[PDB]
Design a protein around this ligand. Structure first.
Ligand code: FAD
Ligand code: MTE
Ligand code: MTE
Ligand code: MOS
Ligand code: FES
Ligand code: FES
Ligand code: NA
Ligand code: NA
Lengths: 1253, 443, 49
């Protein structure tokens, strides 16, 4: 016993000291040091840690290959299995695999953090089905999340595996399935005696018995011990419970039994949910449809429950015993008169799985051996129902289980989920009633009202009934089909599961090796797919390196009376606890470590530095501190207005006379819109490592940031040492979108000081739940508007008023409100327009930049007017092209100088807007309980910081005597491909092939005094710096290319050196002239503008509120893109972030401003099935933009605002619903919509947990 | 491997008064089994062996004979302590045959006017070092005591010796002299320097800070230096030929100047401000604070076929007088006093340079008196380690050790009229050798 | 003792240490080179030629 034996990538791993708590993911990265597979959460929601496990079944002789989440896989459960990670299927060091190739060259990769998991979610699929259909591709992907690309380039690469241009499909390698790693034969012999395995850890012992007797024995002796197979529950629930003893029933055969005989299907506990799927499909397909009513219900529920990874491990037993309040399988299992076969050390027994088996029923000492589920009697019907924030891979807001036995009602039964704290008379009254609904609606309504956290009761009760109806018709159909309006029949049709990217090519005469304009793959693309890209956390731990954990304020506004950490310091392997009194110098207008009071519900109060993160996590949880609440407490902006609590003054912009224009206006309109906030959700959580070079106070800092310079000073000012002592490096970042600009500078300082007193390297990596709490996101925004318009739609005057919740510290807030105001006018000329805005500050975490930086927030309000006015008048696009810019005109800040119309026009064509709107209108005449909507939104965005010096940028280009070039600049690779571009540039001006040129990282050693990588100007400014370095150098080789005008680049440089010509040169860009004067309210800030537009279309389910995105078209002025493949990716991605902001992504707080939604399990970003299944993007024909390098145009933030096309696509569906029978708030979610569409059911109950901020 | 052993074959035609009229000297050196820097050694040993003496008719040939021993390479002095030692073996040989005093025969053949080397390159405060050395050491007084001592003592004898020296510095081709730097100014006023040289303990790094301090006119403390790296300064040359800080000194100077000139307008709008306010405003006004420096190198060229050229930018002049007492019965000896004068000419760091001389002198001393390598007939190295290889310890160096730089004097070629003293001291060790040699004679 | 020279640097996880065997002869052909014992010796990862 005791020795853990499993194979990693065909190599034999044998662990003599196994710890029942360490999971596979830690083991790979921290002990074997295969950093390829990474964690971006830990909830099992993002698949970023997907690996493949292979199992040999000696009794069957089969070799199974299934995917799993390594963050939840206990290494103690791998004994005898094999594991394959990303660097197991290929690497540039040997040879790369078709999957790694096609994903990189097809541009299914930007930031690279989510890629190893995609590769391994696809590889797996191949190992199972080397020529996979799409339904299978979708199954294998349902469980991977990406925040950059939008899923299009990834899916597309997968699709390449079955039966202009961005890449060359014909150079791909072919798949040779017989070339893969061969299941280790050591493991095969090993699978052919039986005896207990037991592993001991620091705090926990893992016992896995080999016989049912011994299992039953351990249970009785250890009734507390949990039985772990999936660990998809204990994994989460445990995190702060710890068990001194854990049991694995895995090895017990009697728990993996499937007997289908005669009068019922009997399923063993241990069967995974994948195994239950496959067995239930095999059985349902060979049986009549009258006998399979409940099998098809489970089947229906199993198909969307979580992803593949999780279904591959989650157990039938585990699922049942844990009885989750929103479980999808339980509510049907229990309404079908199913049976649990349990066995204790006393004897056999059977307990039913009934409505109250889900109490607040197995005795502690018995184990579930299998569940008996019976075939359906000839005259009974069962049906499952469900509602979720996303079609798959997310729990039900509310799900239902229902059954009846007749058309007089002989029996009845209904089990709900998502209302009672568990799965919860009205049906008993319905026995003998003919198929009674209107009656049963009132009954069910009062019932569920009688029977919690989560809020939105109204909606939850409305669905509960809404499923009643669905069941009502679902069964009336089988009744008529066995022996019925069409407008009704539709509701029983559920929505299943879901492009051409076009650009102008490069000049005919342009040589191959000049890469400008060329869709060059992201230089790190392949490395992203092989797991060779070293991000921050992937760095080896140095002897003595310590790990940091921080305890944060659990109160919104409070004095800190007592702070006792005595238990901590003593805890295992802790070396020090750092507090505010340990900061050698400056501590922050915001503080690294809380002093005296705490002003927000996430503020860090102290940090503990252990010899393992686990030792630091479980120590920090035993620090004790008591608060004295400080009333007044401010959370909602509506609060910060009453208490007149703000950040900076009011800022106002005016043009024309709004007061006089208001009277000569035909009509007036007043109202207000709220907008939700949003979390960045970079896949690489905030991360930094501080490493004393052990001398003159010097130190290296490897940090995941958008601004290494800022970080640099933020640390030198905290420790009180010169900038010249701290060298700050950044080779790549696993996503940013703005959230890594301010924050990492702070978090680096927090760790910097821990390194002071401990005197050693500190590694500071935030778990996600903390990351979402500590670092904040986009500024929510409340809009107050008054619109004076004419009867024909033309808007004459607008007095619009913005406020935004900035949080508890300034950060970039004030600049946001400045920006949201400048840009909110968008594409429209409102001849008389006044707009004011102030940043009202609150006791919430400090908000910061986000892709779009204020524009998606403020623009959305003005768009809410165009559709409002269009409504009052009675067509949207008509009202929009009335007020859109026409001639050369001026912004509200008087700047001047339009192919905006072109994008609009082209969009009106490429989408066939008018034809489709026709089909939509018709659809709405055919459909009642379902409606469609279509929307096309214009956009005039712009780019760049508001002061000249903010635009500067630098480079240092190096030419060695062998002809190879080393570039280095101020920008930072976040996945948007700056690094790639700077190589393209360097290639033009040095006229050598990209391959001669190489780029290491960004560092304050090579380019001093840099500015954050933001405002969508990254490559514009650095592009110029790097250009300047190359030019300067070339000019120096002038005489050298004359004496040998036909020589080789190699001979030139050697001679340069021999003739004392310097091959070390630096570049610089003073920046674009920009200035603004808020007092006169006018100035020229932005160097140019980005014009675009989008037409989206959706279909909403009036009964549940859900909706699917059908098609989306995007035209955007890129104007001679520097890398068509890169930019198109930006647009596609940024569009989806936009989409999530307006339709899916929700943050919720309790009255006192504590963050409810902490993580992927509760925070829902778009997955593969959320984005419009038909997604087209196209850049307008290239056009002069001589200002920027090579007439390019930064498209980094552009796409975001264009998401609200899906919003207004939805908004028109709702109207068309209500019509046959406003001003919508930003997140238009399932809730908001369902309610918007009121019907017989929503009229039953009227109306806290959550307060919108 | 290490320094190249050297066999000398010489023929000296001299007059009865000591003046040497002709010398046909022939050098060979054991280079080992691979070229390495060998060929350049024998080139150098030949160029410099003439030393301080004008032999009006002088032929010298040298070839690098290769063997099956480990590959030999550079060593402080690079060929000069080896080749010079042979010519000095003539001055004392001739002085012997004449029965004339050594220093008499030496200042007869020493350079007088402006003259030319054996490769035709062309003032002289060599004499000054000699003169000053003849004084500071009280050479003539002490030689008297020594002579007396030898009349009193039989089984023990003393000896005193004073040797002149004309050394020089630098690689034999222009491009070998180039050097670079990348100086960085952050917005808090702190400066990060970085160059091509490498700290070996002779204090380059220290000097480059001293330089940076002049040209930026900020205190050394504002300035900091991390390391040498091919990331920051590409295509560099080895840190050798005693020119380390001359060349890099120029590169770093160039980086500073370029920068200062960029802050010109900034120190006018606020001429009385602080270095800190200046830089912050530079940044805000889009003035680049990242600049690189460069030094094309000193012009140097040699044409071995015509046998003439100008290689070295300048010369280092010095001299040493040492004194010892040998134990005729055991062969042992103790070093009693040693004086050294050396033209440093406006040293950039008196403490650094003086250290160089003191040290390099002792390496010289060990080469001629203590340090031994021994091989078996088939060329296997016997002495492998400290237990068998004896370097000078605290009790070996002359218990009375004086060093002094000649009064500063213009050398406008090099930065700040400085003069690289890295290898200088080495040859001057043979003063202890010839100090010993005269004891033996007197015995 | 705060000056970090080369050897003073920490050993990284996996960092290996090198030793070399040298010719014990002045001038010679190399007839046989067998290192089989080495490769097997304790904690050796590779022999490079
Ligand atoms: C990302 C994600 C998404 C999900 N989405 C959904 C969803 O949409 N709908 C839904 O219904 N569910 C969902 N789930 C829940 C999932 O189905 C459960 O985690 C799973 O069914 C539990 O199985 P397990 O083996 O991992 O439980 P474990 O964590 O192994 O343990 C379950 C509990 O039951 C006990 N136990 C386990 N096996 C036995 C046995 N043989 N005999 C007696 N006792 C036993 C254990 O002691 C333990 O306390 C989701 C889970 C995740 C991670
Ligand atoms: N893949 C990816 N796309 C991204 C980001 C990122 O970090 N990763 N950052 C966004 C933000 S907020 C900005 S400002 C731009 C920065 O790119 P630029 O330097 O080319 O403007 O990329 C945008 N799109
Ligand atoms: N402490 C110390 N001093 C030293 C050396 C050394 O290695 N260590 N090298 C010597 C040699 S051989 C040379 S070439 C010079 C180099 O001097 P520079 O680097 O100032 O030109 O340093 C000399 N003095
Ligand atoms: O400016 Mo980008 O970080 S919203
Ligand atoms: S890390 Fe396992 S799913 Fe997020
Ligand atoms: S590429 Fe998928 S997260 Fe950045
Ligand atoms: Na803020
Ligand atoms: Na040699």
């Amino acid at each position: 016993s005791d020795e853990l034996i499993f194979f990693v990538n065909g190599k034999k791993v044998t662990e003599r000291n196994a710890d029942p708590e360490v999971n596979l993911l830690f083991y790979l990265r921290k002990v074997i040091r295969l950093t390829g597979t990474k964690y971006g959460c830990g909830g099992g929601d993002c698949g970023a840690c997907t690996v493949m496990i292979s199992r040999y079944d000696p009794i069957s002789k089969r070799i199974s290959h299934f995917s799993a989440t390594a963050c939840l896989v206990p290494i103690c459960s791998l004994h005898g299995a094999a594991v394959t990670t990303v660097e197991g299927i290929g690497s540039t060091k040997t040879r790369i695999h078709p999957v790694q190739e096609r994903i990189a060259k097809g541009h299914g990769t930007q930031c690279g953090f989510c890629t190893p998991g995609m590769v391994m979610s696809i590889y797996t699929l191949l190992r199972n089905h080397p020529e996979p259909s799409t339904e299978q591709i979708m199954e294998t992907l349902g469980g991977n999340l990406c925040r950059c690309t939008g899923y299009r380039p990834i899916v597309e690469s997968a699709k390449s595996f079955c039966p202009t241009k961005l890449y060359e499909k014909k150079e791909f390698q072919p798949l040779d399935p017989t070339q893969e790693l061969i299941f280790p034969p050591e493991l095969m012999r090993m699978a052919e005696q039986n005896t207990v395995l037991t592993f001991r850890g620091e705090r926990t012992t893992w016992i896995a018995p080999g016989t049912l007797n011994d299992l039953l024995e351990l249970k009785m002796k250890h009734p507390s011990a949990p039985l772990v197979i999936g660990n998809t529950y204990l994994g989460l629930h445990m995190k702060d419970v710890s068990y001194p003893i854990i049991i694995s029933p895995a090895r017990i055969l009697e728990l993996f039994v499937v007997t289908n005989t005669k009068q019922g299907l009997t399923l063993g506990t241990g069967l995974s949910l994948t195994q239950v799927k496959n067995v239930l499909s095999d059985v349902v397909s060979r049986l009549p449809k009258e006998k399979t009513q409940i099998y098809c219900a489970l089947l229906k529920q199993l198909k969307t429950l979580a992803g593949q990874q999780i279904r591959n491990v989650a157990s039938l037993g585990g699922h049942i015993i844990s009885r989750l309040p929103t479980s999808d399988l339980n509510p049907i299992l229990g309404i079908g008169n199913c049976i649990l076969n349990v066995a204790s050390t006393e004897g056999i027994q059977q307990i039913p799985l009934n409505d109250h088996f889900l109490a607040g029923i197995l005795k502690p000492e018995q184990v579930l051996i299998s569940v008996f589920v019976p075939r359906s009697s000839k005259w009974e019907f069962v049906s499952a129902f469900r509602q979720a924030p996303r079609q798959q891979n997310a729990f039900a807001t509310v799900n239902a289980g229902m059954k009846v036995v007749f058309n007089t009602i002989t029996d009845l039964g209904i089990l709900y989920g998502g209302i009672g704290a568990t799965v919860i008379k009205s049906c008993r009254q319905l026995i003998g009633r003919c198929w009674m609904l209107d009656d049963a609606g009132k009954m069910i309504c009062e019932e569920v009202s009688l029977l919690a956290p989560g809020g939105m009761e109204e909606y939850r009760k409305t669905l509960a009934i809404s499923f009643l109806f669905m069941f009502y018709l679902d069964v009336l159909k089988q009744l008529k089909t066995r022996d019925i309006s069409q407008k009704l029949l539709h509701i029983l049709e559920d929505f299943p599961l879901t492009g051409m990217q076009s650009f102008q090519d490069v000049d005919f005469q342009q040589p191959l090796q000049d890469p400008i304009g060329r869709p060059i793959m992201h230089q790190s693309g392949i490395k992203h797919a092989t797991g060779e890209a070293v991000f921050c956390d992937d760095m080896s731990v140095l002897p003595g390196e310590l790990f940091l954990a921080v305890v944060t304020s659990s109160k919104s506004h409070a004095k800190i009376i007592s702070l006792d950490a005595s238990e901590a310091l003593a805890s295992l392997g802790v070396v020090d606890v750092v507090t505010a009194r340990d900061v050698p110098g400056d501590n922050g207008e915001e503080s690294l470590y809380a002093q005296d009071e705490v002003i927000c519900v996430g503020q860090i109060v102290c940090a503990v530095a252990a010899d393992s993160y686990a030792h630091a996590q479980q120590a920090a949880k035993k620090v004790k501190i008591v608060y004295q609440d400080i009333e007044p407490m401010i959370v909602t902006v509506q609060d910060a207005l009453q208490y007149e609590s703000f950040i900076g003054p009011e800022r106002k912009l005016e043009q024309g006379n709004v007061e006089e224009a208001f009277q000569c206006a035909d009509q007036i309109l007043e109202g207000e819109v709220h907008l939700g906030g949003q979390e960045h959700f970079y896949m690489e959580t905030q991360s930094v490592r501080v490493v004393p070079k052990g001398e003159d106070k010097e130190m290296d800092i490897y940090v995941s940031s958008q601004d290494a310079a800022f970080t640099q000073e933020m640390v030198a000012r905290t420790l009180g040492i010169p900038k010249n002592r701290i060298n700050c490096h950044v080779k790549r970042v696993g996503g940013a979108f703005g959230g890594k600009a301010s924050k990492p500078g702070l978090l680096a300082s927090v760790a910097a000081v821990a390194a002071q007193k401990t005197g050693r390297p500190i590694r500071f990596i935030l778990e996600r739940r903390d990351d979402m709490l500590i670092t904040g996101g986009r500024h929510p925004l409340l809009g107050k508007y008054k619109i004076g318009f004419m009867n024909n739609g033309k808007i004459k005057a607008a007095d619009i008023q913005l406020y935004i919740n900035g949080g508890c510290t300034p950060d970039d807030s004030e600049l946001v409100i400045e920006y949201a105001l400048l840009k909110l006018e968008n594409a429209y000329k409102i001849p008389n327009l006044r707009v004011r805005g102030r940043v009202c500050k609150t006791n919430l975490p400090s908000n910061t930049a986000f892709r779009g930086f204020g524009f998606p927030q403020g623009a959305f309000v003005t768009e809410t007017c165009m559709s409002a006015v269009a409504a009052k008048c009675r067509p949207p696009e008509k009202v929009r092209e009335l007020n859109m810019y026409r001639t050369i005109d001026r912004t509200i800040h008087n700047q001047e100088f339009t192919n905006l119309l072109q994008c609009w026009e082209a969009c009106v064509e490429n989408s066939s807007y008018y034809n489709r709107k026709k089909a939509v209108d018709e659809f709405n005449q055919q459909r009642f309980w379902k409606k469609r909507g279509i929307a096309i939104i214009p956009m005039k965005f712009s780019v760049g910081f508001p002061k000249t010096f903010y635009y500067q940028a630098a480079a240092l280009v190096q030419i060695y005597t062998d002809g190879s070039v080393l570039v280095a600049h101020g920008g930072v690779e976040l996945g948007q491909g700056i690094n790639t571009k700077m190589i393209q540039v360097a290639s033009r001006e040095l006229k050598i092939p990209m391959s001669y040129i190489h780029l290491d990282e960004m560092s304050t050693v090579t380019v001093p005094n840099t500015v954050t990588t933001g405002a969508s100007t990254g490559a514009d400014v650095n592009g110029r710096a790097v250009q300047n370095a190359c030019q300067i150098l070339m000019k120096r080789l002038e005489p050298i290319i004359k004496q040998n005008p036909s020589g080789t680049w190699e001979e030139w440089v050697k001679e340069a050196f021999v003739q004392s010509i310097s091959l070390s040169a630096t570049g610089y860009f003073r920046g674009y002239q920009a200035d603004m004067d808020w007092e006169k309210g006018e100035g020229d800030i932005f160097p140019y503008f980005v014009f675009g537009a989008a037409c989206s279309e959706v279909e909403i389910d009036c009964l549940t509120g859900a909706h699917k995105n059908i098609r989306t078209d995007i035209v955007m002025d890129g104007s001679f893109s520097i890398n068509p493949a890169v930019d198109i990716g930006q647009i596609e991605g940024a569009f989806v972030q936009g989409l999530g902001l307006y339709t899916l992504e929700e943050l919720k707080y309790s009255p006192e401003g504590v963050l409810y939604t902490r993580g992927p399990h509760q925070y829902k970003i778009a997955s593969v099935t959320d984005i419009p299944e038909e997604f087209h993007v196209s850049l307008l024909t290239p056009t002069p933009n001589p200002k920027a390098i090579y007439s390019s145009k930064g498209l980094g933030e552009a796409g975001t605002f264009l998401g609200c096309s899906v919003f207004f696509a939805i908004a028109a569906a709702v109207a068309a619903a209500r019509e046959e029978r406003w001003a919508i708030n930003s997140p238009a979610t399932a809730e908001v919509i369902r309610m918007a569409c009121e019907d017989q059911f929503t009229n039953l109950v009227p109306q806290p947990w959550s307060i919108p901020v | 491997g290490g320094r190249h052993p050297l066999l000398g074959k010489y023929k000296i035609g001299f007059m009865n008064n000591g003046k040497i009229k002709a010398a046909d000297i022939q050098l060979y050196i054991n280079g080992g089994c691979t070229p390495d820097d060998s060929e350049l050694v024998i080139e150098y040993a030949l160029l410099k062996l003439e030393n301080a003496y004008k032999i009006p008719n002088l032929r010298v040939r040298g070839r690098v004979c290769k063997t099956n021993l480990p590959s030999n390479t550079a060593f402080r002095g690079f060929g000069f302590p080896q080749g010079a030692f042979v010519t000095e073996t003539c001055m004392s040989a001739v002085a012997a045959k004449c029965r004339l005093p050594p220093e008499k025969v030496r200042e007869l053949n020493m350079y007088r006017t402006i003259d030319r080397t054996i490769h035709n390159q062309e003032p002289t405060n060599l004499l000054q070092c000699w003169e000053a050395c003849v004084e500071n050491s009280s050479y003539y007084n002490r030689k008297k005591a020594v002579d007396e001592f030898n009349q009193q003592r039989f089984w023990k004898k003393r000896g005193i010796a004073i040797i002149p020296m004309k050394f020089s510095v630098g690689f034999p081709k222009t491009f070998y002299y180039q050097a670079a730097a990348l100086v960085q100014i952050y917005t808090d006023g702190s400066v990060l320097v970085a160059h091509g040289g490498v700290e070996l303990g002779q204090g380059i790094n220290t000097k480059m800070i001293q330089v940076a301090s002049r040209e930026l006119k900020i205190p050394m403390s504002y300035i900091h230096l991390d390391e040498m790296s091919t990331v920051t300064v590409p295509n560099t040359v080895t840190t050798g030929a005693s020119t380390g800080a001359d060349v890099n000194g120029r590169a770093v100077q160039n980086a500073c100047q370029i920068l200062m000139k960029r802050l010109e307008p900034i120190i006018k709008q606020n001429p009385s401000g602080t270095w800190e306010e200046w830089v912050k405003e530079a940044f805000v006004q889009s003035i680049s604070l990242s600049a690189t420096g460069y030094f094309r190198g000193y012009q140097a060229d040699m044409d071995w076929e015509k046998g003439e050229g100008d290689i070295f930018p300048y010369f280092v002049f010095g001299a040493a007088c040492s004194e010892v007492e040998i134990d005729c019965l055991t062969g042992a000896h103790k070093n009693i006093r040693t004086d050294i004068v050396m033209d440093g000419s406006f040293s950039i760091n008196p403490a650094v340079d003086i250290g160089q001389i003191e040290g390099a002198f002792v390496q010289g001393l060990g080469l001629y008196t203590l340090e031994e390598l021994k091989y078996s007939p088939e060329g296997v190295l016997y002495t492998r380690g400290p237990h068998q290889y004896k370097i000078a310890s605290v009790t070996d160096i002359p218990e009375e050790f004086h060093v002094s730089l000649l009064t500063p004097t213009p050398n406008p070629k090099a930065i700040y009229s400085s003069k690289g003293l890295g290898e200088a001291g080495t040859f001057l060790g043979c003063s202890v050798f010839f100090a010993i040699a005269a004891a033996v004679a007197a015995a």
